[PDB]
């Protein structure tokens, strides 16, 4: 596997978005991953609708602004036969009526692939060979809220009780040794103003810090 990966530099990642006061990070993590896989398949980067997921995926087990999971979103896109674009089904950060329109669909998936739970090397392989990967993490800390730069490491983090969905767009390392000071490159959905231009470097190969490899998946396009 490569010493580092950064899919933002290959055209796979849309600009950072903001979920605002709605518990929809699972929807942004799912649109992030599908944006990457649709780009790998067609060469075209098209922003996807988190609102479509928030309003329409209750049958699959999501609860809109009250929470959800990325695998349930990919299940919704499969069962539904499509997903609309960000442009055509805009984000408003509140639960609304499902207005899915097939004529506006710009993405599809046949299901999803799961990364072995807890296996950071399996996750490294997925990021290197597939593209951006949806993951869950423990973001329940003021150190995360006011994160600004560097490799994030929180002693109080859990690898099992996770509360936020994000997107791993790469991995890397600080310094000349590729085997130390390693990190996961993670795209958040709290706006470009949060963190490091909307991104955070999370400690990698440090016992699955914050659960990044506990519930990772990606859509099959």
């Amino acid at each position: 596997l490569p010493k580092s990966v950064d899919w933002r530099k290959k055209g796979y990642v849309t600009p950072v978005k903001n979920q605002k006061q709605c518990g929809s990070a699972w929807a942004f993590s799912a649109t992030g991953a599908l944006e990457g896989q649709m780009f790998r398949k067609t060469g075209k980067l098209v922003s996807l609708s988190e609102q479509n997921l928030v309003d329409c995926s209750r049958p699959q087990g999501n609860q809109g602004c009250n929470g959800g999971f990325m695998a349930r979103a990919f299940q919704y896109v499969k069962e539904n036969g499509g997903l609309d674009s960000e442009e055509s089904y805009p984000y408003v950060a509140v639960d609304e009526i499902c207005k899915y329109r097939p004529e506006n669909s710009v993405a599809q998936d046949t299901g999803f692939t799961v990364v072995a739970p807890g296996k950071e090397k399996a996750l490294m392989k997925a990021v290197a060979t597939v593209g951006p990967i949806s993951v869950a993490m423990d973001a329940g800390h003021s150190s995360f809220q006011f994160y600004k730069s560097g490799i994030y490491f929180e002693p109080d983090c859990s690898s099992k009780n996770l509360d936020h969905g994000v997107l791993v767009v790469g991995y890397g390392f600080e310094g000349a040794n590729s085997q130390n000071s390693k990190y996961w490159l993670v795209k958040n959905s709290w706006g470009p103003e949060w963190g490091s231009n909307g991104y955070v470097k999370i400690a990698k190969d440090k016992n699955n810090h914050c659960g990044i490899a506990t519930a990772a998946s990606y859509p099959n396009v």
Binding site: N62, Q63, N66, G67, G68, L162
Partner: peptide
């Protein structure tokens, strides 16, 4: 509704 777990991940927010």
């Amino acid at each position: 509704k777990k991940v927010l």
